[PDB]
Write a protein that binds this ligand. Structure first.
Ligand code: HEM
Ligand code: HEM
Ligand SMILES: *Cc1c(COP(=O)(O)O)cnc(C)c1O
Ligand SMILES: *Cc1c(COP(=O)(O)O)cnc(C)c1O
Lengths: 498, 498
């Protein structure tokens, strides 16, 4: 029966204070990045340590708050590291032959790093990930050439349908295939122990008072915390676990209602082999709301384009470093980029749909003019023209009636678009078009519709995807054409009273 | 009348051979990146020079093909550079006060860099971009806190509705607002002349035989080509223009049918001030197909996650460096990341929808088993259960009938999902659930449907978004449940004949 248990307790005999000389493992030092990178894989590591200027103090931190930004790696996640190490170690092992197939269960970042490295190094790749993870990860993977298999999100790691189970079943059916097994592989936390912690230590010049990291496989926090407990004994290690996962200690903290959560990449229903919970000094629970709030905040305030787990981490950090005082510094790990989450926590519609943003929370911060009917804009019914009308003729019409723009509406009363006087003239002067040509040749095709009873805020959101907003009867009937500028002119006029 | 013409010829008096001492402009040297970055903006520049190993030789290049990967910048595009420079110069100018509003017309990358820098440095930001650009750019921008206005893509730069026009109209209506004007600003090509070209020169140790870049505002190719013609006179400069734009020389090359194209960020209906076409040694036309092909190829082969303009560039480069021979090297500029294009050229559905991929081109590379009806899988009609059934009871049923899994179908014949024997047992042993509990507590909710007449390839694509594929009558009737593994077992059996 070959399925190796991912939650198997660690056989590692490391304990704080064992001389490094005693370690069986193969260790690699970070190497200086060259002038010319010979391949893309060398762009992994040497990530920037960027300071958190605003978010720290907004919450009243007396300390220095640092972020190790790992989304600057080639694959765009902290997983690219282990992804390299694993494969490289698997080549020195002689276990991984050229042309072999690599199969991995993953949150999907590890999958990205691996499929990438495969694309470069000529390995076939098969990634198994939960149904929960974002479609962006899928798009990137399929672009890298990796075959993709999905597993239910409700599956237990014990059950055959889980990503671990499906990975193994695939290994057993496929020749020359290996499972690099990020949960049990020593290469994973060794990646962080050898490089990431060396980096964090060098960048901080040895002075470090706290570290905070979200816990996945547990490789990051483990690998870091071991080298930290060795080289920086004073440093406290703080873990972040989502509600619904079991990772945190003590167990009391795990008692909760939801078994599912929206944050991708962190937390599990089992304790992975590579996770050493003994090196973690304190655990904190984060939830989905805290996560996305603080992620959005990282973006808007610090200008770090990063994913949700990062939000969980920082949300925890501002609570955890409160005990710190001036002169101390706290490093926080930011795992991956916004690239994965584009249609999820980055999109307001999804945030509403999943109920993290209440419409109230939005509306309170919004201006006076936000809740107002569009009718109050002073719209004027525009002249309409047929698509089959002739250009110069339309100019004659627009000038003769004194109109600057017209919606082009079909014979059937279907609005096809817009033509503007300006674009017409400019197009003519240039000889791009003739006075005898169809007006369709110059029509701006794209627009959006609204009721006279819609809120101006609605208009705002629309005006972010379109230039023209046609207020329409519930028709061939256009009560008005509203652009962004017109809304401006409205508000600015309402200003010159006070 | 304040609208400054973007296509205004350059007032720059530089000509090759003027001593740099004579230059009026303020020049900045690239600075060594610190241990701790004090803010994120310091992550701009020092981009990697990564070699192209496969794509070069596949097309028979005898030369060394290098890529300057600019998507590693903080905002994820080459625009972050000018975005910094512009703002920084605007602060030394004393023109930009704290709290001022910055308004920019843009392809959207410049907008991202600018809005980012605004988020960091406390400037209000308003970005005007065409309706054509991708919604991802919008999502990122809105996340950074920038207000967004869109303009028709058919608008001429002369007409008031163009992004340039709308930008200016906004400057004129808004107090404390400035237009940094990437088309006319010297800060833009000076950014590349001062840093990017210094970088390219250092990384290549002075030996460079060719440079290829796509042309936007023209800042990149200009700024680079000037310092190149000064410091590396032998180097040929090659520009890339999309079909439908006017940028290329001589004019004969521009004669074309389409006025529109899908590639974002490059090409224009006018020649920007900052573009110096005299330093460009030869021009090449690229189109949409070449672009997306080669972009996808960059990803799949070289593992560079990058956008379309990059594809145009490389597609040109493999044609242009053919004249080169062994021992020479050619640098190619890769502007931005895949982040922007996720739902466009990265998604196969969009590639089909826009007709760049013909279904034939796909099907030819696909295996023997690709065109086969799903019926040929040997499906077995599964036992169905009600959502209201009890857990232990379902176990009794599944074991008693020898079935391992059942679709959970509603009383109304609506399929709600799946329960598997394994997940049931594992859940019970763990005490997560009781024998008396509703089966709904453990249902895998997500699946997809197919006809018995569907192609196995269809099944493949589906099996990338879902674990379960339920083949269904056109109903309460499930002819079978197909997972990825089952398709594997099918094919692998069809293998053991030969
Ligand atoms: C003096 C230091 C260390 C010693 C003596 C040591 C020793 C060992 C040994 C002997 C094993 C294999 C047990 C077996 O399979 O029979 C092992 C496994 C492992 N080691 Fe270490 N180790 C050290 C440090 C580390 C560090 C710093 C890390 C990473 C943070 C690490 C990661 C692992 C992992 C993930 C395993 C796999 C556990 C398993 O296969 O069940 N080791 N270690
Ligand atoms: C010895 C070298 C150079 C000299 C003497 C020089 C001179 C000038 C002068 C005098 C102007 C302003 C004309 C006016 O507004 O009255 C100008 C504008 C400008 N310069 Fe240079 N320049 C040099 C190099 C460069 C380089 C290397 C770049 C960037 C690649 C550059 C970029 C620009 C740009 C974009 C303008 C704006 C043109 C306009 O406002 O219409 N200059 N230059
Ligand atoms: C894997 C991952 C983590 C967790 O890192 P571990 O080393 O597994 O603890 C956090 N966030 C994201 C996005 C991840 O992919
Ligand atoms: C701006 C841009 C370019 C062109 O660079 P220029 O310096 O304007 O010539 C190419 N690709 C993308 C994605 C861009 O945003």
């Amino acid at each position: 029966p070959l399925w190796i248990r991912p939650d198997a307790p660690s056989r590692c005999t490391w304990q704080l204070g064992r001389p490094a000389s005693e370690s069986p493992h193969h260790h690699t030092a970070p190497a200086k990045s060259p002038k010319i990178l010979p391949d893309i894989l060398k762009k992994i590591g040497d990530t920037p340590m960027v300071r958190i200027n605003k978010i720290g103090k907004k919450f009243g931190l007396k300390c220095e708050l640092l972020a190790k930004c790992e989304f600057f790696n080639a694959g765009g996640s902290v997983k690219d590291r282990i992804s390299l190490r694993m494969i490289e170690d698997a080549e020195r092992d002689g276990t991984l032959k050229p042309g072999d197939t690599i199969i991995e269960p993953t949150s999907g970042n590890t999958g990205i790093g691996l499929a990438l490295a495969a694309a470069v190094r000529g390995y076939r790749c098969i990634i198994v990930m939960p149904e929960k993870m974002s479609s962006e990860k899928v798009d990137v993977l399929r672009a890298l050439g990796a075959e993709i298999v999905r597993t239910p999100t409700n599956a237990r790691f014990d059950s055959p349908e889980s990503h671990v189970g499906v990975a193994w079943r695939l290994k057993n059916e496929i020749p020359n295939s290996h499972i690099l097994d990020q949960y049990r592989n020593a290469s994973n936390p060794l990646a962080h122990y050898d490089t990431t912690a060396d980096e964090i230590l060098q960048q901080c010049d040895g002075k470090l008072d706290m570290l905070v990291a979200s816990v996945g496989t547990g490789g990051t926090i483990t690998g870091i915390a071991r080298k930290l407990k060795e080289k920086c004994p004073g440093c406290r290690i703080i873990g972040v676990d989502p509600e619904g996962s079991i990772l945190a200690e003590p167990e009391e903290l795990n008692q909760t209602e939801q078994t599912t959560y929206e944050v991708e990449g962190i937390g599990y229903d089992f304790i992975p082999t590579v996770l050493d919970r003994t090196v973690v000094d304190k655990w904190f629970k984060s939830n989905d709301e805290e996560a996305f709030t603080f992620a959005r905040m990282l973006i808007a305030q610090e200008g770090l384009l990063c994913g949700g787990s990062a939000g969980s981490t920082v949300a925890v950090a501002v609570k955890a470093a409160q005990e710190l005082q001036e002169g101390q510094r706290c490093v926080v790990i930011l795992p991956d980029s916004v690239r994965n989450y584009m249609t999820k926590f980055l999109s307001d519609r999804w945030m509403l749909q999943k109920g993290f943003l209440k419409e109230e929370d939005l509306t309170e911060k919004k201006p006076w003019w936000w809740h107002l009917r569009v009718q109050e804009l002073g719209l004027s019914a525009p002249l309409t023209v047929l698509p089959t009308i002739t250009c110069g003729h339309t100019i004659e019409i627009l000038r003769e009636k004194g109109f600057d723009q017209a919606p082009v509406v079909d014979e059937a009363g279907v609005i096809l678009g817009m033509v503007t006087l300006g674009n017409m003239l400019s197009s003519l002067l240039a000889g791009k078009v003739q006075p005898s040509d169809q007006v369709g040749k110059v029509i701006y095709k794209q627009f959006k519709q609204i009721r006279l009873t819609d809120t101006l805020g609605r208009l705002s959101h629309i005006l972010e995807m379109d230039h023209f907003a046609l207020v329409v009867h519930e028709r061939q009937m256009v009560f008005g054409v509203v652009t962004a500028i017109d809304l401006l002119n409205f508000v600015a006029a309402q200003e010159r009273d006070q």
